[PDB]
Coordinates of C-alpha atoms and ligand atoms in Angstrom, one line a residue:
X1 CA 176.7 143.4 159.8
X2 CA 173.8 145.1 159.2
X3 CA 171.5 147.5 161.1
X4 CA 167.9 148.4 160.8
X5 CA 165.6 150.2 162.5
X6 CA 162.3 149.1 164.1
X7 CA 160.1 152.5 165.0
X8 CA 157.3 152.4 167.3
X9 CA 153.9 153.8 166.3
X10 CA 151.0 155.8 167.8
X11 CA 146.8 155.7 166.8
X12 CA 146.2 159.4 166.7
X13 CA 142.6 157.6 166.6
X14 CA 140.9 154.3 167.2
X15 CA 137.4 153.9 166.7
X16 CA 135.6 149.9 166.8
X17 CA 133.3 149.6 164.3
X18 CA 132.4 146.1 164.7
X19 CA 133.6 142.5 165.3
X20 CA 133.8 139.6 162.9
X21 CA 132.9 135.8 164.2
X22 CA 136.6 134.8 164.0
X23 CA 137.3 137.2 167.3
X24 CA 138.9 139.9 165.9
X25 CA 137.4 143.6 165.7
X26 CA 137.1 146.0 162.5
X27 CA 138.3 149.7 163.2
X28 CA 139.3 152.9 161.7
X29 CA 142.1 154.2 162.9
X30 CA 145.6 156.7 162.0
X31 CA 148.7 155.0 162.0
X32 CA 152.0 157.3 162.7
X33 CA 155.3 156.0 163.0
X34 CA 157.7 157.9 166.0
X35 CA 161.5 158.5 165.3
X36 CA 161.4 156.7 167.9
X37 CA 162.6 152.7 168.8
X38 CA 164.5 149.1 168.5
X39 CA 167.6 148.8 166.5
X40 CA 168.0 145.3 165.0
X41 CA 171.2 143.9 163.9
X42 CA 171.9 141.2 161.9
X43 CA 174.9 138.9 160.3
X44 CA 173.7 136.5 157.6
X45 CA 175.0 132.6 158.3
X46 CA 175.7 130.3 155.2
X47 CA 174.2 127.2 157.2
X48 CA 171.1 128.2 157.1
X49 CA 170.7 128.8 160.9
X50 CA 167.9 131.6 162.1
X51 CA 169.2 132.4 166.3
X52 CA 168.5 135.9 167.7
X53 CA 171.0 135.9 170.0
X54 CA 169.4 138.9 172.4
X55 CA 166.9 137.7 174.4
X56 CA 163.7 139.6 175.0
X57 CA 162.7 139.7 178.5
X58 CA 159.9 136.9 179.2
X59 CA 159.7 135.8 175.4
X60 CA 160.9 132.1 174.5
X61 CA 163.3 132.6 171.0
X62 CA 160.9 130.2 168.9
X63 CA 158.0 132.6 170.6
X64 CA 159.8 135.8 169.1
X65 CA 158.4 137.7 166.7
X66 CA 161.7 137.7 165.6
X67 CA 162.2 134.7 165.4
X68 CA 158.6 133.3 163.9
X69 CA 159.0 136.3 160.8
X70 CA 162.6 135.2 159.6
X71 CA 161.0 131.1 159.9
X72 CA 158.1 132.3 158.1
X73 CA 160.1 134.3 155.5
X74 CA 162.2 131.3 155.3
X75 CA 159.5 128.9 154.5
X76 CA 157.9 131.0 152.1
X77 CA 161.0 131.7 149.9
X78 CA 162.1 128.4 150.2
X79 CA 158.3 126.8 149.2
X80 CA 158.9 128.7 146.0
X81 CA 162.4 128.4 145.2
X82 CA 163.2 131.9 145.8
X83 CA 166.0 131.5 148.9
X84 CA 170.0 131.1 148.0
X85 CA 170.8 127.7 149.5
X86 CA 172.0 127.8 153.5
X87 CA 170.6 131.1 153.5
X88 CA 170.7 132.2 157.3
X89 CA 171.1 135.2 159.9
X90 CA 172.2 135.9 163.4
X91 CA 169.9 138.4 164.9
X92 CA 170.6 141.0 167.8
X93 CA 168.3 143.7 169.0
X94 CA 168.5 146.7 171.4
X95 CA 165.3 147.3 172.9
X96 CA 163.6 150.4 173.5
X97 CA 159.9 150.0 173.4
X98 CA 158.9 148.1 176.6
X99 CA 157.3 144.7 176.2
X100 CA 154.0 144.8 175.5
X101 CA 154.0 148.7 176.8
X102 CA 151.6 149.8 173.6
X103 CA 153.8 151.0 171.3
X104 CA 153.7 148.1 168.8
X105 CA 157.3 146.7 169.6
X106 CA 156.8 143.6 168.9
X107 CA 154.6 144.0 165.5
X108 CA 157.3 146.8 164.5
X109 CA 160.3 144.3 165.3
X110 CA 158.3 141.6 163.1
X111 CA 158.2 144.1 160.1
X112 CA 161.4 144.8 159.9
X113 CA 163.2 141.5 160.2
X114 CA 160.9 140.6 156.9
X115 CA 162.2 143.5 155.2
X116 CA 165.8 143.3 156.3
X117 CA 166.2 139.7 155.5
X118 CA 163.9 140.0 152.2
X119 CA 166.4 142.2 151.2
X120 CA 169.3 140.7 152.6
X121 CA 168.8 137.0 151.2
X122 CA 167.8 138.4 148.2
X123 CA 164.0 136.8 148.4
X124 CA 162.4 139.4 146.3
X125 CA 159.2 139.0 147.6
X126 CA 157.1 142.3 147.0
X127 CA 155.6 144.5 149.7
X128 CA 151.8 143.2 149.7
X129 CA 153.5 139.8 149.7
X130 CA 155.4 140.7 152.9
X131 CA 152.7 142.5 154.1
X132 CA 150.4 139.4 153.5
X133 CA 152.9 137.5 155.0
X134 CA 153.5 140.2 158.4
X135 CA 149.2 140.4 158.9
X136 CA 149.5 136.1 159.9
X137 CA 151.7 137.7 162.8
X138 CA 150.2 140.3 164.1
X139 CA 147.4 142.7 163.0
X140 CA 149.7 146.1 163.4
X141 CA 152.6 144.2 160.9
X142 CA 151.2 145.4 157.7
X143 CA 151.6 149.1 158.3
X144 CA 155.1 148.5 159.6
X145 CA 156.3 146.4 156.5
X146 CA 154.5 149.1 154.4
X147 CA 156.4 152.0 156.1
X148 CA 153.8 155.3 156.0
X149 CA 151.7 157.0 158.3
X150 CA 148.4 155.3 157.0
X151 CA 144.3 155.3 157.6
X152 CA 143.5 151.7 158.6
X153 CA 140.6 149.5 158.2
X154 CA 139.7 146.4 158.6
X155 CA 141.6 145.1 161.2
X156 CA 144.7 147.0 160.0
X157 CA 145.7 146.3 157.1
X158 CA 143.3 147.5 154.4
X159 CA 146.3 150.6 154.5
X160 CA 145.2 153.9 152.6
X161 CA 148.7 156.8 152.8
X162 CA 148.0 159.8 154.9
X163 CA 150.3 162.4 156.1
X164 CA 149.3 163.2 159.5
X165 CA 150.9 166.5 160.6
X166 CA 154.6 165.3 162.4
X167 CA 153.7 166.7 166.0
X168 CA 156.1 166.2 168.7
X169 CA 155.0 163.7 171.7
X170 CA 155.8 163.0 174.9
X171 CA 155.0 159.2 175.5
X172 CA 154.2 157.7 179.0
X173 CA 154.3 154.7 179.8
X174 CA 151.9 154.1 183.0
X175 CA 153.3 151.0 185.6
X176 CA 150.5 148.1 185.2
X177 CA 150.8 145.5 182.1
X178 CA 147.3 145.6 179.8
X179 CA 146.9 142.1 177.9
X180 CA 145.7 143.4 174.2
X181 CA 142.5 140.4 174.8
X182 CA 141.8 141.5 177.8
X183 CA 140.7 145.3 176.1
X184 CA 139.3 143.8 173.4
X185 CA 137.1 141.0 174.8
X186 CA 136.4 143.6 177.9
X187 CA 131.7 143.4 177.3
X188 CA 131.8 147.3 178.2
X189 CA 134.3 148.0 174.6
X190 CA 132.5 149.8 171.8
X191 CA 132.1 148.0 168.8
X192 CA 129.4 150.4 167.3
X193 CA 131.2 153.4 166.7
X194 CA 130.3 154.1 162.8
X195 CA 132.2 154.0 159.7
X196 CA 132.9 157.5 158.9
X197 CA 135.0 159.0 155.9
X198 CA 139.0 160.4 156.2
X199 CA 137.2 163.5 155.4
X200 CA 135.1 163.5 158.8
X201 CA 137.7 161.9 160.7
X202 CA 140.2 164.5 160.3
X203 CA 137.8 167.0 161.3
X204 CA 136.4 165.3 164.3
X205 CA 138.1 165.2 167.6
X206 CA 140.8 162.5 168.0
X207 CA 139.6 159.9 170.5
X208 CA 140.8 156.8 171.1
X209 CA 137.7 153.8 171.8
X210 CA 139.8 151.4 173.8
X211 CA 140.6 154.5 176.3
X212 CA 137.4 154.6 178.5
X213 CA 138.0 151.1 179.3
X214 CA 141.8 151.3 179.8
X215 CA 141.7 154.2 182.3
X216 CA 138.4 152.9 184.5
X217 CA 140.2 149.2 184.9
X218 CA 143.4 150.1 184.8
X219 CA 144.1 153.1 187.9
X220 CA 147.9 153.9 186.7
X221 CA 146.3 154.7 183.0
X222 CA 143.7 157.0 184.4
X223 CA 146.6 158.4 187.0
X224 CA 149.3 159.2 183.9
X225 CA 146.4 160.2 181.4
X226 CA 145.3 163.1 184.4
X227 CA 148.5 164.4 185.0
X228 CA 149.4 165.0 181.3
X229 CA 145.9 166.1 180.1
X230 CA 146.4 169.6 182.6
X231 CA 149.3 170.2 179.4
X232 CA 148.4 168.9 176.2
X233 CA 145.6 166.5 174.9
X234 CA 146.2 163.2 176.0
X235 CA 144.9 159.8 174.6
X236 CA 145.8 156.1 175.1
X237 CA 147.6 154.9 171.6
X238 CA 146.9 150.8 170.6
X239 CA 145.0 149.0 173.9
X240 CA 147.4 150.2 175.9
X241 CA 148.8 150.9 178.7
X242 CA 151.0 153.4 176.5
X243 CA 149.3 157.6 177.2
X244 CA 150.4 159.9 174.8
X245 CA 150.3 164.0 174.6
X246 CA 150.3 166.1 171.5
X247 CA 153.0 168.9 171.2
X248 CA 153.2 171.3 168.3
X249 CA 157.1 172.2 169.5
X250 CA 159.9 169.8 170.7
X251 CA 160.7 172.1 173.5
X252 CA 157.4 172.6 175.2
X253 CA 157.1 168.8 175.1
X254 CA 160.8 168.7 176.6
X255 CA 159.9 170.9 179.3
X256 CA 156.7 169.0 180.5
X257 CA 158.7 165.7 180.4
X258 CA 161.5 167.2 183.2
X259 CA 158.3 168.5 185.4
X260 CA 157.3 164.9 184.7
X261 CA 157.0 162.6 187.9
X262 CA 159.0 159.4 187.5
X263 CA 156.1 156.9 187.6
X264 CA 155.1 158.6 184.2
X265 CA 158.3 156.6 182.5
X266 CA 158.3 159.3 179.9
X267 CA 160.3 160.1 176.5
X268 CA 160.1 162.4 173.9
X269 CA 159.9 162.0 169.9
X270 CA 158.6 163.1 167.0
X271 CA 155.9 161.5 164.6
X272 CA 157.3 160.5 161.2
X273 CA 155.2 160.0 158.1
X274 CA 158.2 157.7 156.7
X275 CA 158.9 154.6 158.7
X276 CA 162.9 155.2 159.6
X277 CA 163.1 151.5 158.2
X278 CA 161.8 152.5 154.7
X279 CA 163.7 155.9 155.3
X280 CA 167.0 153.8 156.1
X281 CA 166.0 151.7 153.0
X282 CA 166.7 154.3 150.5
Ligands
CDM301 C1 144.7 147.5 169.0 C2 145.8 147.7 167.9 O1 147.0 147.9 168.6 C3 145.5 149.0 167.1 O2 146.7 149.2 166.3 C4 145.9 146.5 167.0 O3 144.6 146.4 166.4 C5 146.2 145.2 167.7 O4 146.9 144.4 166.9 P1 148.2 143.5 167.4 O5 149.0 144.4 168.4 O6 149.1 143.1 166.3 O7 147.6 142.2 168.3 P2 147.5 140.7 167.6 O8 148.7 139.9 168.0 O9 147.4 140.8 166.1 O10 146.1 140.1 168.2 C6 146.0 139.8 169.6 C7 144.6 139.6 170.0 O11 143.8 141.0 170.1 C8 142.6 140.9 169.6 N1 142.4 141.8 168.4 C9 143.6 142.4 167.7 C10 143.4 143.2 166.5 C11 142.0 143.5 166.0 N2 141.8 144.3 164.8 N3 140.8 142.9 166.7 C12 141.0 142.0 167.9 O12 140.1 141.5 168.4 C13 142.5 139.4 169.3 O13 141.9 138.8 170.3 C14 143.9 138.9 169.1 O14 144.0 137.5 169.4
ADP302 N1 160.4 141.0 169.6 C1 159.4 141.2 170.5 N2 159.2 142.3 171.1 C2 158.2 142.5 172.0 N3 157.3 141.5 172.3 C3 157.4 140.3 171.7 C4 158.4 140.1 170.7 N4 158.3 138.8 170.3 C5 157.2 138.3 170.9 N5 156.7 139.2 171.7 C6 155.5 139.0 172.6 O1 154.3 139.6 172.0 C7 153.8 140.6 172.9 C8 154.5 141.9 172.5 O2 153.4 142.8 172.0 P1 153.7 144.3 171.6 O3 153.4 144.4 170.1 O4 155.1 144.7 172.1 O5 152.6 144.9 172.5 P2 151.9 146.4 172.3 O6 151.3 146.3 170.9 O7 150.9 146.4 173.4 O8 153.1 147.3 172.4 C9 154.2 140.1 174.3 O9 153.2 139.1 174.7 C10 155.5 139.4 174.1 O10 155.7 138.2 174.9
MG303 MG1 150.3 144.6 169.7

C-alpha cells in the first residue's frame, strides 16, 4: 500500500479578465499549495478493478473525482497501449478539506490519483499529458498535477512557476455552501478587470474578484471575513466560501486561531511552493 498526499491550495489573487462563449471565465491569478490536506491510499488490483472504497459525503463513486481520474487514466493508457494488462487499484482517502468548502479538494484529490497511479501502473504518461488529461476534470487540476506555486491564466492552466513568499495562514471556513456556478454566472461578477503583467501584480494589492460577491450574498462569508480582517488581511481564496488571513509567523497565526469563535471552523498551515505530492515524489 501506498500513500500520497493531496494538498489544498489558496489564490493569493483572483482577478476576471473576461469570459469565453463556451461559459468559462479567463483570469489571472496565484496558485499556492498549503501543507495542508487529504491523504490518499491506494493498493493496486491485478483484475483490473478501479473501487474507492471511502466514500465522500454526498458524492456517488462513478461521480468521484477519484474515481473519473483513475477511469480516465485508464482509458487513455489503455487507447495507446501503455497499461500492464488487469492493471487496477483500490482507493481510500482521509478527508480533510471540506466538500466543496474552497480549498480545491476535489481538483487536488483528482491530481494526485493521476500521478500516483501514472506512476504506480507504470503508464509513463508525461506531466502536460496528465495535466492535459487533469484540465477535462476540473479547471484547478493542472496546477495540482504540475505541483508549484504558479501564475495562472487562461482558465488555469496556461501555468508560469512562481515562488510566492511561504506565509503562514489561518484558514476559515464560513457555515453556508457556495456552488462555484453560482459565483461565476452571478451578472454583478467582474469580468473586466485588465490583464496586467507578474511584474504589476506582485506589486499591487492582493484582492480576490469573486470576493465582493461572495461576502454581499453570502452573510456567514462577510461575518468570518470581519472578524479576521481586525488581525491580518483577509481575502476569500477560489469562489468560495473558504476566508483566509495572511501571517508572516506560525504563532501569531496560532494565537488568533484559539481567540477564534467556533463558527469560524478554523486551522492553521503554512503555504508551500512544492506541492507535498511532488515533494513526496522525490
Ligand atoms: C475559481 C477557481 O477555483 C480559481 O482557482 C477555479 O477557476 C475554478 O475551477 P474548478 O474548481 O476546477 O471548477 P470546475 O469544475 O472546473 O468548473 C465548474 C464551473 O465553474 C465555472 N468556471 C470555472 C473555472 C473558470 N476559469 N471559469 C468558469 O466559468 C463553470 O461554470 C464551470 O462549469
Ligand atoms: N474527491 C472529491 N472530493 C471533494 N469533492 C468531490 C470529489 N469528487 C467529486 N466531488 C464533487 O465536486 C465538488 C467538489 O469541489 P471542490 O473542488 O471540493 O470545491 P472547491 O473548489 O470549492 O473546494 C462537489 O460538487 C462534490 O460533489
Ligand atoms: Mg473547485
Amino acid at each position: 500500500r501506498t500513500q500520497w498526499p493531496s494538498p489544498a491550495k489558496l489564490n493569493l489573487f483572483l482577478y476576471i479578465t473576461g469570459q469565453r462563449a463556451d461559459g468559462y471565465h479567463t483570469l489571472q491569478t496565484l496558485f499556492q499549495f498549503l501543507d495542508y490536506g487529504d491523504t490518499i491510499s491506494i493498493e493496486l488490483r491485478d483484475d483490473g478493478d478501479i473501487r474507492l472504497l471511502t466514500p465522500v459525503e454526498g458524492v456517488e463513486h462513478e461521480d468521484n473525482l477519484i474515481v473519473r481520474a483513475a477511469r480516465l487514466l485508464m482509458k487513455t493508457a489503455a487507447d495507446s497501449g501503455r497499461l500492464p494488462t488487469g492493471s487496477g487499484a483500490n482507493i481510500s482517502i482521509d478527508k480533510r478539506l471540506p466538500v466543496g468548502g474552497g480549498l480545491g479538494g476535489g481538483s487536488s484529490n483528482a491530481a494526485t490519483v493521476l500521478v500516483a497511479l501514472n506512476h504506480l501502473w507504470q503508464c509513463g504518461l508525461s506531466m502536460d499529458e496528465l495535466a492535459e488529461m487533469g484540465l477535462t476534470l476540473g479547471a484547478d487540476v493542472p496546477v495540482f498535477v504540475r505541483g508549484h506555486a504558479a501564475f495562472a491564466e487562461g482558465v488555469g492552466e496556461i501555468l508560469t512557476p512562481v515562488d510566492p513568499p511561504e506565509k503562514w495562514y489561518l484558514v476559515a471556513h464560513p457555515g453556508v455552501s457556495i456552488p462555484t456556478p453560482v459565483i461565476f454566472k452571478d451578472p454583478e461578477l467582474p469580468r473586466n478587470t485588465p490583464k496586467r503583467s507578474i511584474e504589476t501584480l506582485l506589486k499591487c494589492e492582493f484582492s480576490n474578484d469573486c470576493e465582493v460577491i461572495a461576502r454581499k450574498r453570502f452573510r456567514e462569508v462577510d461575518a468570518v471575513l470581519s472578524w479576521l480582517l481586525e488581525y491580518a488581511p483577509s481575502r476569500l481564496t477560489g469562489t468560495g466560501a473558504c476566508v483566509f488571513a495572511e501571517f508572516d509567523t506560525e504563532s501569531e497565526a496560532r494565537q488568533v486561531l484559539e481567540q477564534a469563535p467556533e463558527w469560524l471552523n478554523g486551522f492553521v498551515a503554512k503555504g508551500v511552493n512544492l506541492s507535498p505530492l511532488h515533494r513526496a515524489m522525490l
